[PDB]
Design a protein around this ligand. Structure first.
Ligand SMILES: O=C(O)COc1ccc(Sc2cc(C#CCN3CCOCC3)nc(C#Cc3ccc(C(F)(F)F)cc3)c2)c2c1CCC2
Length: 244
């Protein structure tokens, strides 16, 4: 039942995202190739030009590129939950369009540690203090994501926890302009029932983790709100996914 539902969604995750958290930690701690460090202008330039052969404006462009693949991954992850696919086009568009941002940040925690973040599907590691050395308000906008992720990562979540968690962020009954509110509220309810089951089996002694995770969702929301607001003060394939 609920053990098997957790597992079904764990599969669509593994099948739809290339950088699992396991893969991430594997590289950061170096199992068996070591990421190219970017700590300054020289190394950033090498990572763009070649290792052998404005600056605020380039780090930020690179943050936006990542997103293109991430959204594609989410849309598929999403569409691979059968309940999601049984929803009407208008509902599916609304759910991805409001969810993706929270999810994109929830997942970012996977590739982030105290010292920096993995880049170029795993082959580069840009350092936190290089990122802090950028002019405002560009560094104003990257820091609150590092702060969220370090907090987030302290919760010891693993891919199978994350899979449900992302399912919960997308399938969310509060999104503005949903047509079938009660249907979305029912599915989440299930995704939530099972998240809770999962956590209390897979984190037997972390006893306030679920209500902690719920706070993280509220927290993520606020983090997007502010991200939208900060971006304002700065620049001043298939049918459905071409829409989100
Ligand atoms: O355009 C905007 O919205 C503003 O810029 C952003 C746009 C998007 C983001 S999120 C993000 C996500 C991800 C990711 C990922 C991978 N995952 C998806 C699959 O599962 C595992 C995790 N990476 C980044 C980034 C970055 C980055 C930062 C710096 C550089 C540099 F090294 F300078 F070139 C290169 C890349 C940002 C962020 C920012 C600033 C803060 C974080």
């Amino acid at each position: 039942d609920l053990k098997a539902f957790s597992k079904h969604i764990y599969n669509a995750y593994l099948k739809n995202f290339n950088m699992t958290k396991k893969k991430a930690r594997s590289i950061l701690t170096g199992k068996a190739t070591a990421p190219f460090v970017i700590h300054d202008i020289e190394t950033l330039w090498q990572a763009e030009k070649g290792l052998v052969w404005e600056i605020s404006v380039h780090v930020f462009y690179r943050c936006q590129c990542t997103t293109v693949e991430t959204v594609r991954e989410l849309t598929e992850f999403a569409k691979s939950i059968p309940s999601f696919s049984s929803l009407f086009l208008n509902d599916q568009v609304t759910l991805l369009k409001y969810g993706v941002h929270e999810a994109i940040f929830a997942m970012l925690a996977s590739i982030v540690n105290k010292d920096g973040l993995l880049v170029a599907n795993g082959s580069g590691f840009v350092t936190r203090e290089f990122l802090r050395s950028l002019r405002k308000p560009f560094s104003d906008i990257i820091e609150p994501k590092f702060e969220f992720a370090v907090k987030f990562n302290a919760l010891e979540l693993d891919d199978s926890d994350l899979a449900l968690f992302i399912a919960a962020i997308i399938l969310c009954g509060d999104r503005p302009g949903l047509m079938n509110v009660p249907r979305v509220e029912a599915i989440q309810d299930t995704i939530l029932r099972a998240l809770e089951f999962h956590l209390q089996a897979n984190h037997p002694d972390a006893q306030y983790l679920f209500p902690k995770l719920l706070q993280k969702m509220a927290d993520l929301r606020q983090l997007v709100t502010e991200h939208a607001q900060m971006m304002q003060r700065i620049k001043k394939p298939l049918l459905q996914e071409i829409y989100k």
